[PDB]
RNA sequence: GCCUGGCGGCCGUAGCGCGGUGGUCCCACCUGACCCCAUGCCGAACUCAGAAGUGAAACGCCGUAGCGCCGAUGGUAGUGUGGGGUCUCCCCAUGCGAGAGUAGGGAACUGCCAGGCA
RNA sequence: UCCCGACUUACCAACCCGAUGCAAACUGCGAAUACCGGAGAAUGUUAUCACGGGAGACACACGGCGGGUGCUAACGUCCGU
RNA sequence: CUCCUCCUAAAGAGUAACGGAGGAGCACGAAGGUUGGCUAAUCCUGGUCGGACAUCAGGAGGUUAGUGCAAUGGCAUAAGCCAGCUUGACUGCGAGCGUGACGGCGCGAGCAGGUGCGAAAGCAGGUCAUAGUGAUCCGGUGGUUCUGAAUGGAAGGGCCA
RNA sequence: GCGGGCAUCGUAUAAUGGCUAUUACCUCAGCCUUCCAAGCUGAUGAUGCGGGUUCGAUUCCCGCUGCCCGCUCCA
């Protein structure tokens, strides 16, 4: 929301200096993040991958995408076609509006949150850490769920080495030890 | 890649009208203006062409690139290939999705006349 | 434990460049292309490439890939 | 070969049938097509897949 | 002895054994074997002049073995007949055409070399000359 | 006459890397999506509105041989015909003659609209 | 602190990089010949096709060339010519 | 012991051996038609459990993947992958060829009648192709107003499936 | 010249695709003065070795480490 008008005004004039860019098209944007529930407990049940789906079109506000499994494997007992894990992308100011809430509300209740990570870039400018936590975010609660299954949230901004990616995002006031 | 992937889909569509011989009106589109050319049945140069590049059909209009700029050019190219005697074209998407302005181009083409 | 082959298929070049055909005769039986059919020449179901009109017969590396086509020219 | 022969015969009344495999241990629905009838000269609707 | 640790086939056709090497100048080392006659080299008589060449210098300096035996040749039992399928195989060969570099040496004085490549030249059926590496 | 865009000819001497470079003329991202439309989730893509921004990415054009790619001449291999020598396998006469590799070439060349000084 | 592993072992050893060979079921190359078609002249008792009357023959052998098999044995065997 | 693929096989076709290696005796109402999209294997890195590998994200790579089933020829315009709607896995034919001693087998544009797909134009007579098969006789079952042993029927036969 | 398991201490399951299932042997424990006979309570398998195809091999496809019946003749 204006986490998505922060871009227009706090991080420009901020981040036109930091590296001392081109352009108004050089600064870092952010392009997606998408929301990774790696669920390899839905081959002998099936009634909690859907579980799995039923929270993250509650965190996030969209009917959620089940994924294949690409290639079937023998050390985890899969085929091809079968659902393994269940993600969400955002885009557009419905994806600021859930990341105000990763500022806001997550990273406070997370437990024995000491430090922020900050060695977790890709290499290219792409933050990808994942919360061992579903029960931190707060559109669904605590007489609800029977698992605590959590999920990945990966980061994906136009930056080009991690160093703009570190100083790309922690303008929005994403904390690091 | 945007580019790569339309030229991907045309050439398929491109074929069929070199094994056939068949004259091609061919539409480019672009977020602002809209191309149109007719081309004969060997690949080499084109017969007619219209587009809202040209400043004839520029303030003849409220936006060029739009729908109702897609029937400005259905109106011209059309018209101005039967001035030449050219019908029995075929429409190439090159590429597009036959929905939008480039339906609006090919529509407002076939009530001008050209037969398909 | 050997003993096993198959009858010939008879395949190859039936029609060499040059040669004038009549519409319909088979130019060239082939099991995969190796050869794509050019003008006045359809594929086949067996992509055995056949003379859509009559005319001669003409090879020529044509395309991208330099793949091997057969037109026929009347 | 595991795949028994069915008959599928017009619904226009007339004697003509066409026939054709299908899997009857795993398809057990009878197969249905619009198929053309040769008596009629019209696409009609072929049924009983033995 | 020497063989390839898998093949795709298990059977080769005999084949002809026509033309000149390719492999024919003194690569790696100083000093060669080269071969000037025409045959097989059995896997038996490569290994046979291997340990005459390396006991010969006193297992000193390096010594590359520029053929490999990858054919299979087949030999039919005795007494058995004629037909029955092709025979099972019992050996591997390198083909040696005229020309071929067979072994290679440096490291050592070149009189130990050339007595040693001597003492090799006794094990092969194949007559073979020293020669040293050439510029160009 | 350079510049861009469509369609081609052509199919690596045309490709790739590396470096420099271009703006509302064109093209690209880009603004927004409420509806036509649509994503097995996302206006990412497709699609529709309309130009606030930027030429960063892409995309052209200009550099550089780093890499592909192209590549003679001569020689060698092989070989048709003929005649010779002998385990195999060659040699003569004559005709054809590579592949590889050297020298070197090489940063493609070309038929419609539009733009701006002519 | 079995987690350190700093101290390094004539090392098992990829993938890559350089050099060197081999292949019949390898091919980023690629002949000679042969084969198809076309156009020419000379030559050949139509040699060429078709249709019909009558056949025989379907145990081949060796020699050159290209090969499979065999032992690059066989006056061996099995193909092509 | 029939069939398919490769090599032998001599750069057209063909070509033997108790020569060298493999496969078939099906599957599929979608795995067929069409229309609209799409583009892999592997690897690196990032890392809720998660390990070499589940999923996600980027980079590399450029088909080393995939092709219902062997191997070979193919395949990016994909013949690979996904959904939409569907029955052309149509009926009668078929110029013309290819291939066999023959029986036969194969390819086929086009025409006729109807049909499917396009919110327009623009294809389909099964599947990427090549194995997945059995002559005749004798019957069986439907259809057919073709024959119907004095005639009218019928039986049997024919023809079509 | 067929190929049947190459299965736990040992013997027999699971041989057209997971987890490994019987019976003895066994290590412990209780009865008995001590042994037995018992009756309880447990232990373990790269499934000969290594190759393929495989998503995955006790399972297939070859190898090939021995073996038990084989048949190696007509003169």
């Known amino acids: ?177 | ?116 | ?74 | 070969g595991i795949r028994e022969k069915i008959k599928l015969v017009s619904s226009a009344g007339t004697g003509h049938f066409y026939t054709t495999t299908k899997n009857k241990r795993t398809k057990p629905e009878k197969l249905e097509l619009k198929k053309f009838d040769p008596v009629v000269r019209q696409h009609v609707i072929y049924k009983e897949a033995k | 002895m020497l063989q390839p640790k898998r093949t795709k086939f298990r059977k080769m056709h005999k084949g002809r054994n026509r033309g000149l090497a390719q492999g024919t100048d003194v690569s790696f080392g100083s000093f060669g074997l080269k071969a000037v006659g025409r045959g097989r080299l059995t896997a038996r008589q490569i290994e046979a002049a291997r340990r005459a060449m390396t006991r010969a210098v006193k297992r000193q300096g390096k010594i590359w073995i520029r053929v490999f035996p990858d054919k299979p040749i087949t030999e039919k039992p005795l007494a058995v007949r004629m037909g029955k399928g092709k025979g099972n195989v019992e050996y591997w060969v390198a083909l040696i055409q005229p020309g071929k570099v067979l072994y290679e040496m440096d490291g050592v004085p070149e009189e130990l070399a050339r007595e040693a490549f001597k003492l090799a030249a006794a094990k092969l059926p194949i007559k073979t000359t020293f020669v040293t590496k050439t510029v160009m």
């Not at chain 2, 259905?74 to 929905?99: M, N, P, T």
């Open chain 3, 1 to 74: 434990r050997n003993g096993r082959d198959s009858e010939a298929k008879r395949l190859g070049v039936k029609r060499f460049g040059g040669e004038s055909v009549l519409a319909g005769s088979i130019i060239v039986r082939q099991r995969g292309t190796k050869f794509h059919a050019g003008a006045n020449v359809g594929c086949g179901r067996d992509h055995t490439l056949f003379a859509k009109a009559d005319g001669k017969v003409k090879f020529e590396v044509k395309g991208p890939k330099n793949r091997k086509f057969i037109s026929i020219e009347a």
């Open chain 2, 1 to 116: 890649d945007k580019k790569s992937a339309r030229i991907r889909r045309a050439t398929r569509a491109r074929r069929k009208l070199q094994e056939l011989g068949a004259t091609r009106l061919v539409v480019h589109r672009t977020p602002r203006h809209i191309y149109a050319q007719v081309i004969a049945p060997n690949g080499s140069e084109v017969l007619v062409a219209a587009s809202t590049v040209e400043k004839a059909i520029a303030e003849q209009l409220k936006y060029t690139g739009n729908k109702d700029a897609a029937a400005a050019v259905g109106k011209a190219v059309a018209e101005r290939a039967l001035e030449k005697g050219i019908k029995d074209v075929s429409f190439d998407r090159s590429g597009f999705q036959y929905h939008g302005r480039v339906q609006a181009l090919a529509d407002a083409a076939r009530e001008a006349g050209l037969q398909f």
């Open chain 1, 1 to 177: 929301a204006k986490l998505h008008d922060y871009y227009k005004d706090e991080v420009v004039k901020k981040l036109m200096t930091e590296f001392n860019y081109n352009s108004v098209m050089q600064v870092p944007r952010v392009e997606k993040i998408t929301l990774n529930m790696g669920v390899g407990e839905a081959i002998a049940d099936k009634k909690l991958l859907d579980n799995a789906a039923a929270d993250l079109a509650a965190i996030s506000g969209q009917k959620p995408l089940i994924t294949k499994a690409r290639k079937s494997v023998a050390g985890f007992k899969i085929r091809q076609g079968y659902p393994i894990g269940c993600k969400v992308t955002l885009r557009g100011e419905r994806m600021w509006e859930f990341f105000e809430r990763l500022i806001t509300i997550a990273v406070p209740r997370i437990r024995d949150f000491r430090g922020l990570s900050a060695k977790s870039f890709d290499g290219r400018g792409n933050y990808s850490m994942g919360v061992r936590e579903q029960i931190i975010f707060p559109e669904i609660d605590y007489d609800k769920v029977d698992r605590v299954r959590g999920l990945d949230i990966t980061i994906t901004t136009t930056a080009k080495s991690d160093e703009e990616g570190r100083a790309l995002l922690a303008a929005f006031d994403f904390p690091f030890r």
